[PDB]
Design a protein around this ligand. Structure first.
Ligand SMILES: [Mg+2]
Ligand SMILES: [Mg+2]
Ligand SMILES: [Mg+2]
Ligand SMILES: [Mg+2]
Ligand SMILES: [Mg+2]
Ligand SMILES: [Mg+2]
Ligand SMILES: [Mg+2]
Ligand SMILES: [Mg+2]
Ligand SMILES: [Mg+2]
Ligand SMILES: [Mg+2]
Ligand SMILES: [Mg+2]
Ligand SMILES: [Mg+2]
Ligand SMILES: [Mg+2]
Ligand SMILES: [Mg+2]
Ligand SMILES: [Mg+2]
Ligand SMILES: [Mg+2]
Ligand SMILES: [Mg+2]
Ligand SMILES: [Mg+2]
Ligand SMILES: [Mg+2]
Ligand SMILES: [Mg+2]
Ligand SMILES: [Mg+2]
Ligand SMILES: [Mg+2]
Ligand SMILES: [Mg+2]
Ligand SMILES: [Mg+2]
Ligand SMILES: [Mg+2]
Ligand SMILES: [Mg+2]
Ligand SMILES: [Mg+2]
Ligand SMILES: [Mg+2]
Ligand SMILES: [Mg+2]
Ligand SMILES: [Mg+2]
Ligand SMILES: [Mg+2]
Ligand SMILES: [Mg+2]
Ligand SMILES: [Mg+2]
Ligand SMILES: [Mg+2]
Ligand SMILES: [Mg+2]
Ligand SMILES: [Mg+2]
Ligand SMILES: [Mg+2]
Ligand SMILES: [Mg+2]
Ligand SMILES: [Mg+2]
Ligand SMILES: [Mg+2]
Ligand SMILES: [Mg+2]
Ligand SMILES: [Mg+2]
Ligand SMILES: [Mg+2]
Ligand SMILES: [Mg+2]
Ligand SMILES: [Mg+2]
Ligand SMILES: [Mg+2]
Ligand SMILES: [Mg+2]
Ligand SMILES: [Mg+2]
Ligand SMILES: [Mg+2]
Ligand SMILES: [Mg+2]
Ligand SMILES: [Mg+2]
Ligand SMILES: [Mg+2]
Ligand SMILES: [Mg+2]
Ligand SMILES: [Mg+2]
Ligand SMILES: [Mg+2]
Ligand SMILES: [Mg+2]
Ligand SMILES: [Mg+2]
Ligand SMILES: [Mg+2]
Ligand SMILES: [Mg+2]
Ligand SMILES: [Mg+2]
Ligand SMILES: [Mg+2]
Ligand SMILES: [Mg+2]
Ligand SMILES: [Mg+2]
Ligand SMILES: [Mg+2]
Ligand SMILES: [Mg+2]
Ligand SMILES: [Mg+2]
Ligand SMILES: [Mg+2]
Ligand SMILES: [Mg+2]
Ligand SMILES: [Mg+2]
Ligand SMILES: [Mg+2]
Ligand SMILES: [Mg+2]
Ligand SMILES: [Mg+2]
Ligand SMILES: [Mg+2]
Ligand SMILES: [Mg+2]
Ligand SMILES: [Mg+2]
Ligand SMILES: [Mg+2]
Ligand SMILES: [Mg+2]
Lengths: 150, 44, 117
RNA sequence: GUCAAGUGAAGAAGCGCAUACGGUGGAUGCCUUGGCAGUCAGAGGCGAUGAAAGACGUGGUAGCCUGCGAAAAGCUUCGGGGAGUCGGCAAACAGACUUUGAUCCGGAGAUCUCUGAAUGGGGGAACCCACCUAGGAUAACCUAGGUAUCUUGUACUGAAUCCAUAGGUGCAAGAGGCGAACCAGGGGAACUGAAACAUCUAAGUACCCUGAGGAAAAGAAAUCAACCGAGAUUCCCUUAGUAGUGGCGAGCGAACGGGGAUUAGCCCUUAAGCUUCAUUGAUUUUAGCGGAACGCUCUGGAAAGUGCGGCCAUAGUGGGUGAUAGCCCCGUACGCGAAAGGAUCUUUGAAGUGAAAUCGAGUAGGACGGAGCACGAGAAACUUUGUCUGAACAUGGGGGGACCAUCCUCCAAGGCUAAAUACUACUGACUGACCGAUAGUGAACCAGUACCGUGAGGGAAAGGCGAAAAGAACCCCGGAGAGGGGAGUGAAAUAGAACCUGAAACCGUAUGCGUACAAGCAGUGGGAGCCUACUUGUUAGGUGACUGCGUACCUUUUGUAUAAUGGGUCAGCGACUUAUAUUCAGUGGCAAGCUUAACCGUAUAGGGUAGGCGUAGCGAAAGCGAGUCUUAAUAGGGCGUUU
RNA sequence: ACCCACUCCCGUUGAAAAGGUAGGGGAUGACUUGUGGAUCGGAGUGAAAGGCUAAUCAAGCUCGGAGAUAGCUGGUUCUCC
RNA sequence: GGGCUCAAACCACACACCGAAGCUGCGGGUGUCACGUAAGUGACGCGGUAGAGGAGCGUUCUGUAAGCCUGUGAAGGUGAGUUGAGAAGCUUGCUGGAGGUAUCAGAAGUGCGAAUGCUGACAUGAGUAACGACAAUGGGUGUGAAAAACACCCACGCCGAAAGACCAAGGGUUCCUGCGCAACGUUAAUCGACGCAGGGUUAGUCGGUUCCUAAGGCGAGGCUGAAAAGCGUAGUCGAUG
RNA sequence: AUGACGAAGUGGUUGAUGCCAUGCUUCCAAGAAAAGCUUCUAAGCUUCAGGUAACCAGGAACCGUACCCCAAACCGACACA
RNA sequence: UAAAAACACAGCACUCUGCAAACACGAAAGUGGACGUAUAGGGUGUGACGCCUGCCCGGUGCCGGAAGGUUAAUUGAUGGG
RNA sequence: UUGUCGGGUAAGUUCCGACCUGCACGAAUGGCGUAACGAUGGCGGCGCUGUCUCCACCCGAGACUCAGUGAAAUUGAAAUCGCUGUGAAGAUGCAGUGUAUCCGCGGCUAGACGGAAAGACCCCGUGAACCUUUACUGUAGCUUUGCACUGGACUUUGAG
């Protein structure tokens, strides 16, 4: 904190409580006692711990009927209207789309959609696999999941 | 009772003015410090 | 991250002062004075749950003594007589009879007098 | 009826409690104008062509801020732009400008007082006094330019002193000063720790000083290694808190080796580079342009909210708009855009430099005294040098931690060299399990201000009407006041300008009950009466006569009502955190294995298994090994082995 | 006059962070005084009291090392078992 | 303490009774064991500082959440009722006028009465002390909303080697005039060194500048010094002359 | 305030700490400097320039100036004994 | 909060100092001493004046001496590895 | 020790003179005297007096009352009596008892261990500062010698 080098008054005699600085954390406008500094919050997760959690999530998604498997999923043009029509045929509104390789047109078509996310297999984090109402996954991405976690 | 401040603008200038400060290197440091803090008044 | 204490602190202080209602001076207006008064009143209230049972029994026994002496018996002789003749009417009910049902109380005293001799 | 005795309400100067309504005050909530921290870029300097920083001026009207400089909220021009404009506090009237394209935005020019390195001389900064040249006025001057010092170079002159030299004069080029950090170097504490203290630590830290650059420094083995080899420098992770060092105290603390990031080497028989000026193309930056798609209905002051039905999306969690908007506005994704200037890459060319010339001699080595190497004299190698000395010449020399021999490895006393690395005062964008007016910058507000100080220096407080001023015409009291009462505006005025909400302390007015024969932590247990309200008395609320019991709290103590400590009260703030190593427990993953670090990675994935721990111990150790150590001992015994 | 400060009283939240009233000493001198200047922090200056160096002196003030250190004092905030 | 004496004292004996949060009764909660693979039963426990162990409440932010609630009224504020063993929760009247957040997780600037704590506000003392030289006032008139204090007049009193008039330093508009009185003035104020506006300072001779130097400063070269610098020559400043 | 006129306006005495006086006397502690000013020349200049005197003509720039100043305006936080 | 008997003082004495003085401030240059030169300058003590100022050189200091002992850096005989 | 004697007083731990038994004077840290001087210490006297016996009266300024303005320290909260006991050992608050209607104003200071300043005395802390010295360890300065700058010559000086 700015200033605060000088002792505000002599230690004895004035009748006040003894003070060393006007920036004591006791004082208004003084320092924060345990002032924060920029620190990192990332924990370590074991590689196998991460994979075991992914296996648990994938098994639970199948058991809860929240996993939808399709042979393929491609859109022709990067049009949001086209993707909405495709997902309405499958009856999906809140959905995470997992593909082996994220298509450039598919990425653009889903960018503005409210509750639709398109991810590569490597990009399918535990949080997105749980948050989204359904996880539509292609057959190619299912096999790519098997190689990674099995 | 004579008090400690007996004003003399000539003495004030010769001891604390701009040219008194610029004459030495520690005086130039005062002007650098007071410019860095942004003092509206630099010398007296 | 930063947590202001104003709303929670005000709710705490108001609960204490609401309990200090009716107290004199600072004991009903000033928090750190009202806080001591609310604690002390609680200490008294806990202790006076015990003392109330003693106070009422002393009151029953005194009224039974007055009622029985009107019938020729002291309290101690009546209680001994009420044990010789197995009468288990307690002192709260006995003190109510001695005041409100004097004919009933006289019958009990005569039953104790007969039992003694 | 008289007397007597007994009993006895009501009558409160004031006070208490409750409730209602106010006042003061400015908490809380909500909000944001401002901050804080990162990430990605940019730029890494400005200055004698006058800087940073200022003073004084400059406007129709006073001041201050902003801009600008006697050409003075500005002039010229080139682009953008297309209807308003004459900056803000902070408006009111004036006078104007503008589709003959103004205001505004960007590039380039012009002007640019005075002070400040300040530089013609002087000086108490913003002032005083000059000289020289050229021109033009005749009076008492005017315009333009020049006039500092030092360094380098050059020309002319030039003493003591003959030649010279020192010196002097002119000219040309350059420098000086400022800036938060980063870099290299000179000088260099103490508190503190060692539970005292001197060696030691703190620490080559703080600070002072010098120099340079966008980076700097270093850098191409007289280097390690170990008989195998590696192959400049710099940086990150390990090795490892190990070897060692240390009043062997407190502490300090490697390297070898390994994994990575970057990669580059060139010359003294004169090069790679670097600088400048051309020059060929690429980008990039400094203004901008277009940019989709919504209606009805209900509540409402107002619709974006309700209900119903649509459409756009490479644009959907942006900011506003009278409450919550993809489709109302500004934007956003996306696609275009430069007359002119800046910058970065490049293709050639030109000089300049690197440049020390020509392979290193007062050098290597040595003695003394220091310093550094993790290494404090130690058995002390190596580097460096204040004093003093002092080689050899590849058939030579340096190192391999005393020293010697053998072996290996290198070639010092000459140079230049990018990248990976450090930092952010500054500019832009983006972001936040950051703050939200006692917080966050000291500073949200005309803050480094007010104020305090001789001075260096210290250093505040202070945000919110409403959607919109619609900011209350008019009437009345009042001093042609202050302040109010109406009226009106507004959805709301107890939103009325000290204006959102509007807490507490604290101060009042009103009502109810209690209170003037009564002794103390002021309550608590019992409890009459009165009052109020309905539920009309086994009720609720207020008060509470009388009475039992009863010496606050915190701290500190053997022990506190203590006449021990602390607190006038309220409101806000105010104290076990964080990082890195580690042990134990719990709970998970994997399991004779487990796990990665740096780093890479269209990046929380995946790779990377160098390293760490474990699977074997004993011994000081060589070593041996389910054994080992001690010992003459295969005996005893120690530790270990059956998980 | 001016410089000084011996006594008493007052004043002591003062008119005043050292004064006032009444008395007192020096008053051509080692005098008093204005303006300007020099000397300062382990330093100055001192007819010497550890005096004075901006109401601060047995080592000024200001900023920095710095959040020195404090085996000491104080304080340490919601609930229940 | 009142009072007490064939006691209300003392000695002995006896039968009664009072007396605690002890024991029992009745209702409830909780700990640990055991039986229970259950709800629950059984037994024994349940004062407590330092301290260890266990289980929770609440606050701010993040996710859940482009959800849900909300102008038919959010947060906050202020009452009432009600629920739990507690931290606390819930419902509602009024105020308020735009935000809030279920649940379960995750993070903390997470809880205040003390620190002669810090900042602001406001009390008590108390309408008390004081209103700053004991040189001194009285009256009349005017103006004004209002006059002890302003202006004028008539008196009185005080200073007069100053309490008068100046120059310097220092200050800086305080000077004068018109309007004005909120605050400032230790009271009031029409008055003012106060507020708003306007005006006012005229030099050959006064004082500066300019000329000259004192102490002293700076100081080309120079000498000295790790650097920063120190000293000083030529010079150049510097009045108090 | 307004604009014309306006009488007397003379002797004596006393008399400074002011002036002569930067003098005079005396003493010891022995009492600024520089320039302006007068004069003399050197280098230079030699009909010149420059100097002197007279007359005529003209000029004298810039800054301060209000006000308080033993004080209510300065130093003392104050309209401060 | 001390004005004194404290400090100073004239006078006295001791001692240092031959001038580039001793001594002091300064890393140094330099400066003061002093534009002085032992009748001078510094330091120390005493404190007008009058009468005086006695004894002790063991300790410590200072001054003078240098036969002997001891004694630094340095040098490196000799011995042992 | 107020030594003893003498003087001074009615009475003199002070004073003056003296004695010498100097706890523990003493000769330039000077001894002993000393005119003059001193806001210097002690003692005595004259005068003078409200210093006092012993205070009285008077005059101004406060205090007091009214009108205007308007602080302070302190403060856990107060419904804040005596006495005797008790008690962290000296009680407005505890026990017992006595007294006592409620509330101001002028006064006074016995208490509220009254207010003010984290006692300064005392002790402690392996606290600080500054001062001293023949405490320790250092060090500026001063001084000794070697080597360097640094040379020629001649002479007294050991071994080759
Ligand atoms: Mg802060
Ligand atoms: Mg990984
Ligand atoms: Mg009344
Ligand atoms: Mg100049
Ligand atoms: Mg100059
Ligand atoms: Mg010659
Ligand atoms: Mg430079
Ligand atoms: Mg220590
Ligand atoms: Mg540069
Ligand atoms: Mg380089
Ligand atoms: Mg080889
Ligand atoms: Mg659009
Ligand atoms: Mg609204
Ligand atoms: Mg070489
Ligand atoms: Mg060497
Ligand atoms: Mg070597
Ligand atoms: Mg070796
Ligand atoms: Mg080389
Ligand atoms: Mg702030
Ligand atoms: Mg607020
Ligand atoms: Mg209406
Ligand atoms: Mg609002
Ligand atoms: Mg309001
Ligand atoms: Mg009564
Ligand atoms: Mg009472
Ligand atoms: Mg009750
Ligand atoms: Mg009682
Ligand atoms: Mg004790
Ligand atoms: Mg007790
Ligand atoms: Mg107490
Ligand atoms: Mg008490
Ligand atoms: Mg207290
Ligand atoms: Mg006299
Ligand atoms: Mg002393
Ligand atoms: Mg002082
Ligand atoms: Mg010190
Ligand atoms: Mg430190
Ligand atoms: Mg501290
Ligand atoms: Mg019984
Ligand atoms: Mg019981
Ligand atoms: Mg029990
Ligand atoms: Mg039970
Ligand atoms: Mg128990
Ligand atoms: Mg318990
Ligand atoms: Mg909130
Ligand atoms: Mg509080
Ligand atoms: Mg507490
Ligand atoms: Mg009083
Ligand atoms: Mg009074
Ligand atoms: Mg009074
Ligand atoms: Mg007065
Ligand atoms: Mg009035
Ligand atoms: Mg006067
Ligand atoms: Mg005036
Ligand atoms: Mg007034
Ligand atoms: Mg005025
Ligand atoms: Mg000089
Ligand atoms: Mg020079
Ligand atoms: Mg001059
Ligand atoms: Mg003068
Ligand atoms: Mg004048
Ligand atoms: Mg004062
Ligand atoms: Mg006055
Ligand atoms: Mg005055
Ligand atoms: Mg005195
Ligand atoms: Mg003496
Ligand atoms: Mg005698
Ligand atoms: Mg005698
Ligand atoms: Mg003596
Ligand atoms: Mg002698
Ligand atoms: Mg003497
Ligand atoms: Mg005298
Ligand atoms: Mg009054
Ligand atoms: Mg007592
Ligand atoms: Mg009194
Ligand atoms: Mg006291
Ligand atoms: Mg103490």
């Amino acid at each position: 904190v700015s200033g605060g080098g000088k002792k505000p008054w002599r230690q004895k005699g004035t009748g006040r409580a003894r003070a060393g600085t006007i920036r004591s954390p006791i004082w208004r406008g003084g320092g924060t006692t345990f002032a924060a500094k920029p620190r990192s919050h990332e924990q370590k997760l074991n590689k196998k711990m991460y994979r075991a959690a992914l296996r648990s999530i994938l098994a639970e998604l199948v058991r809860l009927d929240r996993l939808v498997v399709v042979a393929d999923f491609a859109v022709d043009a990067p049009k949001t209207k086209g993707l909405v029509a495709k997902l309405d045929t499958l009856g999906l509104k809140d959905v995470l789309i997992v593909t082996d390789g994220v298509d450039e047109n598919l990425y653009l078509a889903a960018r503005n959609l409210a509750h639709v996310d398109v991810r590569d297999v490597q990009g399918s984090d535990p949080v997105s696999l749980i948050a989204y109402d359904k996880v539509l996954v292609t057959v190619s991405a299912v096999k790519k999941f098997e190689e990674l976690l099995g | 009772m004579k008090r400690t401040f007996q004003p003399s603008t000539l003495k004030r200038a010769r001891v604390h003015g701009f040219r008194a400060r610029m004459a030495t290197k520690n005086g130039r440091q005062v002007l650098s410090r007071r410019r860095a803090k942004g003092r509206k008044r630099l010398t007296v | 991250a930063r947590v202001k204490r104003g709303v929670i602190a005000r709710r705490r202080h108001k609960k204490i002062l609401k309990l200090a209602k009716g107290y004199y001076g600072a004991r009903s207006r000033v928090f750190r004075v009202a806080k001591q008064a609310v604690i002390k009143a609680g200490q008294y209230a806990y202790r006076d749950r015990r003392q109330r049972k003693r106070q009422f029994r002393a009151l029953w026994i005194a009224r039974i003594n007055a009622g029985a002496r009107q019938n020729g018996l002291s309290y101690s002789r009546l209680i001994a007589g009420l044990k010789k003749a197995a009468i288990e009417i307690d002192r709260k009910v006995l003190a109510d009879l001695a005041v409100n049902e004097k004919a009933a109380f006289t019958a009990i005293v005569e039953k104790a007098k007969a039992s003694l001799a």
